[PDB]
Structures are given as structure tokens and as C-alpha cells.
Amino acid sequence: EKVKKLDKWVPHELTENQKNRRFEVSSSLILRNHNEPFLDRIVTCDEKWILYDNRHPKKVMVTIWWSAAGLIHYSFLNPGETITSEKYAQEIDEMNQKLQRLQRPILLHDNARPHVAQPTLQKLNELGYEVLPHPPYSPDLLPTNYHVFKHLNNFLQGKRFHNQQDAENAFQEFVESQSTDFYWTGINQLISRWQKCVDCNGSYFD
């Protein structure tokens, strides 16, 4: 049985074992960061379906890569082209190129997805990326979902797009219209979130 949390499908009631993994990771991150601060090294990412009609249907999947410094790279996935480990690998590799030019980094993302397989992992290892521990079923702890994609939504409400290029202009209008303070905030809010999780002994706190 499932429920939608931050647009992501998640247990209608976490198991005891699922709250332990959340508490354990949250606790350790809070401690890690207090002793050896790393928030400012975090690169994070997720995907969101953008619906052509914001009141089956038609929609386009976007992927965004960002850090507290600001946006790094987003791309769109063409309708009917479900993404694979080897292209994600690609995505990663040019994400890294754009980053280098702005400028080791630490990646925070949902590791429990398909395109997160050997080629992908290979790429990150190869490129020198440490992946941050992340408890299963925890959208509340991924900044793209609790921050970025949430504000995107407020921006998307009541919008009808006709062509793909329109959606993309709405997204890109949105991301590009964002201050660096917007990204800085998404990331630096993590510590509070880890704490809030711990206090809830690993349950959802919002």
C-alpha cells in the first residue's frame, strides 16, 4: 500500500525498520557535518514529470542538477524515451563538465532507481564522486523534492502549455529566475531536516 508524499510514491506507514534507517542516517549526517562540514560540496538531483495542462495525458520529464552555489544543469527527456543507466552516465558526465567550469563534490540523490546501475555507479566512481548515504523512501530529505520541485509546483499552478517547447520555457523561466540564495537555502536547510527526522525517531515530520 502506497501514498504520494512529495509527488513520490512512499509507504502509507513506514515500517519500524524504515524509520531506523532514516534515524540512523539522519543522525550520522548531522554529526558528520558538525565535525567535518560538507553541505557546500553537495550536488543533488531528481526528476519531475511536467504536465502540459496544469488545471494518459501528455507531459515531459525534466532532470535538474544543482548545488548551494546555484543551478548546474537541467535536461529534458523526449516523450517516450524512458531513461537508462548508460545515458544517465552521460548526463552525469556533462553535468560534471558544466560544474568544473563554474568551479571534490558529493552527490545526494535517490539511489533506488533503475538508471542508477553499474554504468552510472561506474561513472561516479571514475569521476571521483562520493555518494551520500540516503535512507529509502525519504523525499522529505532530498532538497530537489522538498524545495525546488515544490516551488516549481506553485509556479506551475494554473498553466496550460500546448507544445513541449512551452513547458520547457516555463521550467527554464522558473529555474533561471531563481537567486543563488534560492539554491543555497534548499541545501543548507538539510541540517534542520535531519534533526526533525531524528526527533520524530525517523518518522515523517511533515
Per residue in 55-73, is it b (16+ CB within 10 Å) or e — as a string? Answer: eeeebbbbbbbbbbbebbb
Of 51 and 83, CB closest to a copy of itself? 83
By CB under 8 A, the count of residues binding a copy of itself is 29
Pick one of 1, 4, 12, 36: the residue that binds a copy of itself (CB under 8 A).
36
The answer to whether 32 contacts a copy of itself (rule: CB under 8 A) is: yes
Nearer to a copy of itself, 4 or 104 (CB): 104
Say whether residue 176 binds a copy of itself (CB under 8 A). no
Distance CA 166, CA 159 (A): 10
Q: Which three cell numbers stand for residue 195?
A: 534533526
The one segment of 44-52, 94-102, 131-139, 162-170 that binds a copy of itself by CB under 8 A: 131-139
Give Cβ neighbours of residue 187 (< 8 Å, ≥ 6 apart). Answer: 39, 40, 42, 44, 67, 68, 143
Does 111 engage in binding with a copy of itself (CB under 8 A)? yes
CA–CA gap between residue 4 and residue 45 (Å, rounded): 19
> Among 77, 99, 131, 200, which residue interacts with a copy of itself (rule: CB under 8 A)?
131
Beta strand extents in the chain (DSSP E only): 2-4, 9-11, 42-51, 59-67, 70-77, 106-108, 130-131
Q: Is 46 annotated as a binding residue?
A: yes
CA distance 77 to 62: 6
- Counting contacts by CB under 8 A, is residue 24 touching a copy of itself? yes
Whichever of 115 and 151 has its CB closer to a copy of itself, that residue is: 115
Instruction: Round to whole Å and give the CA distance between 150 and 105.
Output: 25
Give residues 132-151 in contact with a copy of itself (rule: CB under 8 A). 132-133
Would you count residue 3 as binding a copy of itself (CB under 8 A)?
A: no
Is the distance from CB of 37 to CB of 48 less than 8 angstroms? no
Interacting residues toward a copy of itself by CB under 8 A: 16-17, 19-20, 23-24, 27-28, 31-32, 35-36, 104, 111, 116-118, 121-122, 124-125, 128-133, 198, 201
